[PDB]
Design a protein around this ligand. Structure first.
Ligand SMILES: COc1cc(C=O)ccc1O
Ligand SMILES: [Cl-]
Length: 336
């Protein structure tokens, strides 16, 4: 029984969101007292998501979007699979490490556009149809240890995750870098279909009118569970600053042990320079059927000027600082 209220965003705000986010064609919902923001299909799939059955040997990565999710998945999959770089290369990350709630973001009307554009290729059309289907079906059929990605906040996870004490890695990233990276994600994925500029996107983000917001509640729930034996909480900028420490700490939490030589191959694999050429970054299959906007691969290839993105203005930077102050005053949460 899904325990939280699911309500359509107020009419006029919902109308404006549909003008700016072309990946949704019915409307947006707010869930529970915290008003977790999702596209309309959340209402259709809330029960099946919440009743998903976790196993005690699952590995879950839980993040706010663009909080180091992909890099962490690649790291964790390799640590739990004997550093099998060969298999990591040949199977796509999205099959090795499926995204539980991706199907929420494939609207029936948008899927129909994708199918039109791929109508002469039977295998492209099967692929697009499967995107619509819950990952949970294929996850439930697996007979081996599972790797699950989600952006669902702690309070919306299947309760079976904590009942089974599945291992959870929670990664937090500072709001400035998340605002800019999430803005690019919303332009890159036609499932989101955002058409506007950064300042308009920041305005939505600051009002918790972007998927999986409220951002500060997402971070605070992660922080509130980090003492549990089955939760590892890390800040993105700590992880990136020291790969050998990150790899070892993560391995030890997962109950794996590796030589200094093995740690070094993982450090090279995950280094900024080599990771830019990783298949999990390029995402060549979503690009092949045109669900990725190929005109938005600038940010993918280049990233942002560290601590001063081209998109940032002094006014938005000031608003980020004040929003951070309001949300973190009286907590011990502090970004590196
Ligand atoms: C497959 O990666 C993502 C895609 C989207 C939107 O369709 C949102 C968050 C993600 O992590
Ligand atoms: Cl950070």
């Amino acid at each position: 029984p899904f325990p939280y209220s699911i309500d359509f965003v107020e009419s006029k705000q919902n109308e404006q969101l549909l003008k700016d986010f072309h990946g949704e064609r019915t409307g947006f919902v707010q869930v529970g007292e915290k008003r977790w923001f999702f596209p309309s299909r959340f209402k259709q799939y809330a029960e099946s998501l919440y009743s998903f059955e976790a196993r005690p040997d699952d590995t879950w990565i839980v993040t706010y979007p663009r909080s180091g999710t992909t890099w962490s998945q690649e790291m964790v999959w390799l640590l739990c699979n004997e550093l099998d770089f060969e298999t990591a290369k040949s199977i796509p990350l999205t099959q090795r490490f499926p995204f539980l709630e991706f199907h929420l973001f494939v609207h029936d009307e948008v899927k129909a556009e994708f199918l039109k554009e791929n109508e002469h290729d039977v295998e492209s059309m099967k692929f697009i149809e499967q995107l619509s289907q819950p990952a949970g079906f294929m996850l439930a059929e697996m007979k081996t240890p599972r790797f699950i990605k989600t952006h669902l906040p702690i309070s919306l996870l299947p309760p079976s995750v904590f009942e089974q004490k599945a291992k959870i890695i929670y990664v937090a990233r500072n709001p400035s870098d998340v605002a800019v990276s999430y803005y690019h994600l919303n332009r890159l994925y036609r499932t989101q279909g955002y058409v506007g500029d950064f300042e308009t996107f920041y305005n939505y983000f600051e009002k918790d009118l972007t998927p999986w917001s409220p951002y500060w509640e997402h971070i605070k729930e992660g922080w509130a569970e980090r003492d549990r034996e089955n939760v590892l909480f890390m800040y993105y900028e700590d992880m990136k600053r020291n790969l050998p420490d990150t790899i070892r700490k993560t391995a030890a939490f997962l109950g794996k042990s590796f030589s200094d030589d093995q740690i070094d191959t993982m450090c090279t694999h995950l280094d900024i320079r080599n990771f830019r050429h990783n298949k999990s970054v390029t995402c060549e299959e979503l690009k092949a059927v045109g669900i990725l906007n190929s005109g938005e691969q600038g940010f993918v290839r280049n990233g942002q000027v560290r601590g001063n993105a081209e998109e940032m203005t002094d006014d938005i930077k000031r608003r980020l600082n004040e929003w951070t102050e309001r949300n973190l005053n009286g907590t011990d949460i502090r970004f590196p």
